[PDB]
Amino acid sequence: SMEQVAMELRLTELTRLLRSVLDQLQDKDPARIFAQPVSLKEVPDYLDHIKHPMDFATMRKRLEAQGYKNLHEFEEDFDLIIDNCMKYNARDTVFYRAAVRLRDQGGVVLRQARREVDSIG
């Protein structure tokens, strides 16, 4: 149908916008701490601690399959990155501190993204 196409164009354009959002958030992680999944070879107990691992490469795979239906779903995954790190790692660590800085800096990006998603519809 023509409606299904129109819907698919909306999703494509959301995906375009979320790709730019993802790039902007990942720039706030210049150390690449959140770039890839925590290695279960190197942290073998990880899934005992963290039930829903997340990282920027995993988000990008979902994004490129157009697997984010709305900004809320995308934000859920970004918050997992931060929140997982802040639980597994102690406050005095470079990992925790990187997550705080990513959260703080990402907030600004996500605030305007929400306005754009509502604005463009």
State the structure-solving technique: X-ray
Q: What angle do helix axes 71-88 and 94-120 make, rounded to 10 degrees?
A: 170
Pick the CATH number of 1-121 from 3.40.718.10, 3.20.20.140, 1.20.920.10, 3.40.228.10: 1.20.920.10
- Phi, psi (5° rounding) for residue 49? -95, -50
Q: How far is CA 51 from CA 12, 65, 80, in A?
A: 30, 23, 10
DSSP 93: S
Instruction: State the burial class of residue 69 (Cβ atoms within 10 Å of its Cβ: 0-12, 13-18, 19+).
Output: exposed
Query: How is residue 27 written in tokens?
Result: 């720039």
Site of tokens 């918050």: 79
Closest CA to 49 of 38, 64, 36: 38
Cα–Cα distance between 55 and 80 in angstroms, integer? 8
